[model samples]
Target chain A: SRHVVICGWSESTLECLRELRGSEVFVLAEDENVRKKVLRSGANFVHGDPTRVSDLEKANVRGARAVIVDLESDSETIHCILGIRKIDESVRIIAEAERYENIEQLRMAGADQVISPFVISGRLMSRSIDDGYEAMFVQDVLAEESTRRMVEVPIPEGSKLEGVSVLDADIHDVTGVIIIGVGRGDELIIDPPRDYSFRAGDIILGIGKPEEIERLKNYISA
Target chain B: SRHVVICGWSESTLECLRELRGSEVFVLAEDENVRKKVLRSGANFVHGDPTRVSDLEKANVRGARAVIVDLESDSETIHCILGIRKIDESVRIIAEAERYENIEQLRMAGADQVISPFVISGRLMSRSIDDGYEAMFVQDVLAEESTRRMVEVPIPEGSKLEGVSVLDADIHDVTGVIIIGVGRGDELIIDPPRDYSFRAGDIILGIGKPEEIERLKNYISA
Candidate 1:
């Protein structure tokens, strides 16, 4: 009952399943052919139209923790999000937008989060014009099997990072975690200045290897 | 003739144009409706089929520094790449793949680099399941007007970073730029150990503010 519910089938669905491995996941697919692929990835499958609330009930949307709505069209995704919301007001809904302009619309349609792949691809293509290194770097870090990943390290109250300048914290030196931004309240300070002092509530967003992040977690918690 | 030649008209093409602002850009579009939009973005437009060698010649692909092929379909993009290659052997070709599996096929068609927007989007969507911070952070940093950007800081032969441990170099503290990966020859060391020493010819890949990256560049060049 507490499993994650996924709507529709795409290459991204497979990728999402890869990341959510070892978790209870239900793939609600319209295409009958995708059943084998979904089951192969170790996720439960429900055959139905994702945009219909009745079909969503088959997947037990009310009891689901999160619902990932990834469809071919933006219109379908919006409808799917609405259907999920109709069934469960509290469950998290993550939807995909085919067009970047439709991101806001998807959000308004009851999606907790809206992602646009074209925007990401476009940004990478633009960066590729400057240097080959950045494009390759992004590809490596984004891969499912990547040794390193982006992480959030919140500076809890009374943590060692409290009131310490970004430079003085020397988080990278001690933990080998590259702090990219400092999340403060609703604002994310990107490429923060060295002298920018870390407040108790600040969340450190960075990329690090598996062990490095564990070390950082322990360091911050201790 | 020495400008950057772009193929096709899409949202990504506009994004690419935004990044390549202040550069000589020639958008070779098949759609007559997109001419005004391309011109609005300060790019020269040539109305012709991008898959034809004659159309590519009109844009002077041979003399161009680079060609960004961003067609709507993978087959169209592949044909365009092949057409461009027929004329120019040395000009760099950056093509887009609608499908991730076709990236290699596009490369075989003569694209120097192939970017798949769906792959990037899929990766981000998978990451979003864990936390909202990473998705938002990536969105901010990837935007055209992003204050902070990913940069590649290559350490020269006599650079001070040579033979210095990633932690001890204190690049982040000194320059306020977060070093995420170290590029050495063909290998990119991701989230390197704190004691992993840097060597000459190592390219430091990181995210930083414009001024911070500029400062790091000066430091590396010094």
Candidate 2:
């Protein structure tokens, strides 16, 4: 019924605070140093141990729209999750798993959703080493907060989009993808005029739904 | 040249090592215990310090096709990356940062790509708390090794597909998204048969490309 409650004040948790920029959120921490760090983020802080019902209540967990739990150890994180679930069965609970196997354990313990950043990092770094442009495109889409995500599509020789201008491709009209920048080698031209025709080896950066970007990728890479 | 070299034996790094399955990977570690851990994973190992050139050279850092650095600290990780880059100008270097801000430093230190599992951890946990199926689907696609993604699309009241059999909808044939499960309240029917009829208030869990999943979502929610 009220705002979100974020548990833990790990360095990552403080950085994660930035992701809640548009949301009404408060920080719950047991460590005094962490309390000061949370305050520096310009967020409301209530010093409390997430594992204790008293501290959970102190952070208004039962009234929170959702709770984000991110502590150091799996046991501590899962214990806090169990504690929060005990406090409010209806409030959404999101937990972060330090390892991949604990993802299942966290969800089973009543985390409405769970994430493993280590896995994401591995997938991303693998993608980057295997496919650089795809890595950049996928990362752009996944990391963006705006409704539109930017993606890069490389133009190959004799491709369908090579001879046309951005306006000519009906880029936005056909696929809801907008061409925002074009990269040739190390140089990038942002907001190129609508008349800028596609060129071989050019990297077209488009903004739209990830699907739309994929559509553009399919068409251009054809 | 040897295959990818993995540095670090943290729990997360061990879990991330699974991402490199089927590859010829050599792990570099300073601890004999970590050397044993790496060997148990069916990979080669060379006991070496990531920050030392002699150690890196012993690990064949210059001859490795790629290197994955996931140490405990930013400075240590950066030092390792800088050392590896100095040895091999052409090899790919993927470095991990424990905090968000250190990502820039890792990149500046000559990492071909730098990933902060810590930051990704924050973004993902926040997304999980903020959204529902979209969060699950996006995270699944980003974190999983498989190409397919499971997405949930709620059946809106009186939508076009309502009351139709799975065959009648020809859902997969039309969009490449397969109905893997149907959820009603707390229960889920895994791999519901083609004769299964769409029901009101049911959530269809389909697996496919994100865009394809979006197609099903759009139609079912129409």
Candidate 3:
């Protein structure tokens, strides 16, 4: 079975786990007390330092599919990332760097992805300032499988559909897809005007099922 | 003014330009027809492919704040990345590759960041499958600022905040922040109850302004 290996138990790890609900996960921590606490959360827990290769091996790192290093310090996260890479090159390693400055170093140390909590928080806060309600609505929608799937489809140059009006394109007939919006230039025309014309460079945001959206992709590409 | 130099005029380029709406943008395209088409999008257009050093120089690559090579073809994009690096080592470069095979080459070409659209799209799709509307809501929230910055603060052993109700924590009273979630081991509690008791090694999702969130750092190490 594919399993997720989390290097340290932290709030972000919890959120990540929440985000990754229904996945097999293993939590690793050096402190015995903390290890017991993690195990109680219904995940396999190991008491050992992730920066040590022996500890990682004991946690069955070899069989894990993705490893999340949620260490509190940048240095420790970098060290853990490097150690994990040495032990298993195929494991997808996602690490958290406390400082943005350490992001590059962690990447170089073989972290497949590096996320900075500070940067993500700052970005999220700034976004709320621009479009909070719309942002919130989108977030709620993406959190479930039954909700409408929103996708961005780029209109290519020389496409037969370019310059075609929404009504004329018969997109509904083509794939039963609903055009949520048309991204023209710098503006997103949500519930666009009836005469909205599809430009060669416009990115169409559509809503539909997965297979339905995939089928629509072929219609937009040149 | 900080300027973003874009090295291609494909659908992805347009989508990226829309995402970076307020930035001063300059676009480079080898084909005159494509250049004219992209120019209609309201960005400064230069007629030259970025694969050649002379082309990039003409596009004012040295003074730009960041360069994004969004060419669809891997070979051309890699060439442009190398050309940009030769001109200005300090400029951040974001290059896109269609396949995972070319990611290493793009990184070696001095791209500060390399993203595979296929992989990103796949991930996004898979995430939608897992979380549905909630995922969309989170993405929108990330794009807003009124929502507090979402931060992952780890509860260390022997820390002052341990065993305290989240509402009464020093980080909350002084900062006017809220605990968005608690990452306890592999589980996440979004909008956790006010009375949620934090344990050592529990990672908390904090939401607040930059300065306000900074106050929590002391609690982690204290």
Top-DockQ structure, candidate number: 1
DockQ of 1: 0.58
Candidate 3 lDDT over residue span B122-150, tens digit each = 23333432222322333333543443444
- All candidates' chain B TM-scores are 0.87, 0.63, 0.64
What are the per-residue Cα lDDT tens digits for candidate 2 across B51-159?
A: 9888888887777888889887899998898888778888888777787778788879888776666766666566556344333444555555445653467788888
Per-residue lDDT of model 1, residues B94-197, tens digit only: 88877767988987888877777667766777676645667787677777577787777778888767677865777766777777778865567777776798
Fnat for model 1 comes to 0.73
What is the alpha-carbon interface RMSD for each candidate?
A: 2.2, 11.7, 13.8
Worst 10 residues of 2 chain A by lDDT: A131-140
The fnat score for candidate 3 comes to 0.04
DockQ of 3: 0.03
Which 10-residue span in candidate 1 chain A carries the lowest summed lDDT?
A129-138
Residue A73 lDDT in candidate 2: 86
Say which candidate scores most in lDDT: 1
* Model 1, docking class: medium
Reference-based TM-score, model 3: 0.39
Model 3 misplacement above 4 A: A35-37, A150-173, A176-222, B1-222
User: Looking at candidate 3, what is the lDDT of residue B80?
Assistant: 83
Q: What share of the true interface contacts does candidate 2 keep?
A: 0.45
